[PDB]
C-alpha cells in the first residue's frame, strides 16, 4: 500500500509554453492567408488577438 499521489505530475497532453504556441498559430495563419499576406495585415489589433 503505497501512495501514488506523491510523485511528479503526469502530463496527458503536452504543456507548451506561451511562445511556441504563438508561432505555431502564426504558421497555420500564413498558410491560410497564402497569397494575401502583407506587412499591413499584421497590424496591432490583429496581433493582440
Amino acid at each position: 500500500i503505497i501512495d501514488l499521489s506523491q510523485l511528479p505530475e503526469p502530463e496527458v497532453i503536452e504543456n507548451l509554453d506561451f511562445e511556441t504556441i504563438y508561432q505555431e498559430l502564426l504558421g497555420d495563419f500564413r498558410e491560410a492567408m497564402a497569397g494575401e499576406w502583407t506587412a499591413e495585415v499584421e497590424s496591432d489589433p490583429v496581433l493582440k488577438l
Binding site: 502583407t38 499591413e40 495585415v41 499584421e42 497590424s43 496591432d44 489589433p45 490583429v46
Partner: protein, 99 residues
C-alpha cells in the same frame, strides 16, 4: 469610437468603421452570428418577395430596424426605390456621417 478594419486589420475610427458596419448589416442574415440570433437583417429574406407598395413599407422598416438596433451612430435619411430594371430593385440609401 476606434475599431479595426475588416480587411487589412487597420485601425480606422470615423469613415470606414461607419461604412463597414452598415454595409455588413444589410447583407448579414439573422442567426449567422454565434449566440446572437437577433443580429443581422431580414433583407436576405426579402429576396423573391413580390415588389409591392407594402414591400417597400417593410424594407424601409427593416433598414430602420436592423440599423436602429445595432448602429445608433447612423441617422437614416431615405430609402427610395428608384429603379426596377429586370427584377433588380435599386434602393438608394443615403446615410449621414457622424464623428
Amino acid at each position: 469610437m476606434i475599431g479595426m478594419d475588416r480587411r487589412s486589420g487597420l485601425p480606422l475610427s470615423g469613415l470606414a468603421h461607419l461604412k463597414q458596419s452598415v454595409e455588413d448589416i444589410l447583407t448579414t442574415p439573422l442567426g449567422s452570428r454565434r449566440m446572437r440570433p437577433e443580429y443581422g437583417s431580414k433583407l436576405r429574406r426579402m429576396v423573391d418577395m413580390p415588389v409591392s407598395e407594402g414591400w417597400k413599407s417593410a424594407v424601409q422598416a427593416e433598414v430602420a430596424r436592423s440599423l436602429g438596433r445595432w448602429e445608433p451612430r447612423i441617422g437614416l435619411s431615405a430609402v427610395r426605390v428608384v429603379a426596377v430594371v429586370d427584377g433588380r430593385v435599386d434602393l438608394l440609401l443615403s446615410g449621414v456621417f457622424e464623428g
